Ligand binder design. Structure first.
Ligand SMILES: [Mg+2]
Ligand SMILES: [Mg+2]
Length: 171
């Protein structure tokens, strides 16, 4: 299987910082499509669900929002920033996720993902980061190869990797 190598290849530019108990995480995905194509996967429910099945669009625009839906739980996630085909900031748990679509070439984009995880995050922070790394890998895969089989990943292994990254930030 190629799952381990695909995961490593997409973790290459993970970055972490700790400031005043808040963890900041950044990563990047090089995706062979235009920013306009990738923007649809953040702003249309049928595309958003291809990579993050629990999410749906609420509304778009400067007052837009996503919704997170599970059988036992629904929540709205207001946008904190919105620029068509450029960037999107969304409330996430007690912090923020941010998508920045950087054009590399007419059909190549660097999607720069960054996140703020305060100490009161409800999910253990390394598990939330592991989850984002996994679904961002799926986003790249569905944009480039729409019917590739999903990655059979080893969640505990990925979660441990991120545990060690965060633990290293402690003084
Ligand atoms: Mg163009
Ligand atoms: Mg695969």
């Amino acid at each position: 299987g190629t799952e381990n190598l695909y995961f490593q290849s997409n973790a290459m530019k993970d970055t972490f910082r700790l400031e005043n108990q808040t963890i900041y995480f950044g990563t990047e995905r090089a995706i062979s499509a235009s920013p306009q194509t990738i923007w649809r996967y953040l702003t249309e429910t049928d595309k958003l669900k291809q990579w993050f099945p629990e999410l749906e669009i609420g509304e778009l625009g400067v007052n837009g929002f996503w919704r997170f839906i599970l059988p036992d739980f629904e929540e709205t996630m207001p946008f904190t920033d919105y620029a068509e085909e450029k960037y999107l900031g969304v409330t996430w748990d007690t912090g923020i996720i941010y998508f920045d679509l950087k054009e590399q070439a007419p059909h190549q984009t660097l999607l720069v993902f960054s996140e703020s995880l305060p100490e009161n995050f409800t999910t253990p922070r390394h598990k939330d980061i592991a989850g984002w790394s996994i679904v961002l890998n799926r986003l790249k895969q569905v944009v480039e190869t729409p019917d590739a089989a999903p990655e059979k990943i080893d969640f505990p292994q990925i979660e441990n990797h991120y545990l060690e990254k965060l633990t290293n930030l402690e003084n």
